[PDB]
Amino acid sequence: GGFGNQGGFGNSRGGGAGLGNNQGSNMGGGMNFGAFSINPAMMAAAQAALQSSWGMMGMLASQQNQSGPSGNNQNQGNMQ
Amino acid sequence: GGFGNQGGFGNSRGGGAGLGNNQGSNMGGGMNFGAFSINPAMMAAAQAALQSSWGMMGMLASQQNQSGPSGNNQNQGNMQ
């Protein structure tokens, strides 16, 4: 058998809706997703840190260090 | 048999709705998802930290260190 393989999606008259087959990956931190819809309305706001991993080896090493956001200012306006 | 393989989804007349087959991965921290819908309305707000992992080995090592967000300011407006 293989190593680390991923089959396809939505074929041969595909259908349905979702999130599938993620390895070591990040989805979010301020994001909107709309499809096949009528009059959608969405709002997102995030202050965040994300860290992820798949298959990691190490010897006398240091791997993945993250220091988050600090000391920022932000302003977004209105939408009529 | 294989190592770390993932079958496909939504094929041959696919259907239904969901989240499946995630290994060592992160989904969230401020996110909206809508599909095949009429007049959806959604709001999300997050202050967060997320950390995840699959298959990790280590010897005389340090792996995955995270310091979260600190000292920020944010403002989002209105939507008529």
Added chain:
Amino acid sequence: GGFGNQGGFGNSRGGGAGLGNNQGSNMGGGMNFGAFSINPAMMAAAQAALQSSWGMMGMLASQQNQSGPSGNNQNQGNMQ
């Protein structure tokens, strides 16, 4: 069997809607996505840090170091 292969999507009368087959990758930090829709309306705001990985080896090494955003100012206006 192979190593690290990914099948295709949306073929032979494709259909449906989603996110699939990501390895070691990042999706977000301020993003909107709309398709096949009527009168969509979306808002996103993010202050963030993201880090991701797939298949990593190391010996007497240091790998992936990230220091986030610090001390910025931003202003976005209105949309009639």
Added chain:
Amino acid sequence: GGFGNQGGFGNSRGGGAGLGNNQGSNMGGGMNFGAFSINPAMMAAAQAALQSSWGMMGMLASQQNQSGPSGNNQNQGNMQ
């Protein structure tokens, strides 16, 4: 079997909508995407850092170092 191959998408009467088959790559940090739509309206604002990877080896090495944005000012106007 191969090494690191990716099948095609949207062929032979393609259809549907999404994000698929990413290896070691980044999508976001201030981005809008619209298609096949009527009267879309979108706003994005980001202060961010992103880092990603697929298949990495190392010995007496240092790989991927990132110091984020610091000390900037920005102003965007209105859209009637």
Added chain:
Amino acid sequence: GGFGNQGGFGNSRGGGAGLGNNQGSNMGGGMNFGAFSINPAMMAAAQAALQSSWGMMGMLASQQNQSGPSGNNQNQGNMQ
């Protein structure tokens, strides 16, 4: 089988809409994308740093160092 090959997209009556088959690449940091649409309206603003990679080896080396933007000023006007 091959090494690092990518099939085509949108052929033989192509259709649908998306982002697919990226290896070690970056998409964002202030970007708008519209197609086949009526009266679209979009705004993006970004302060960012992005770093990405696919297949990397190293021995007594240093690879990928990035110091982000610092100390800038910017102003964009209005659009009636």
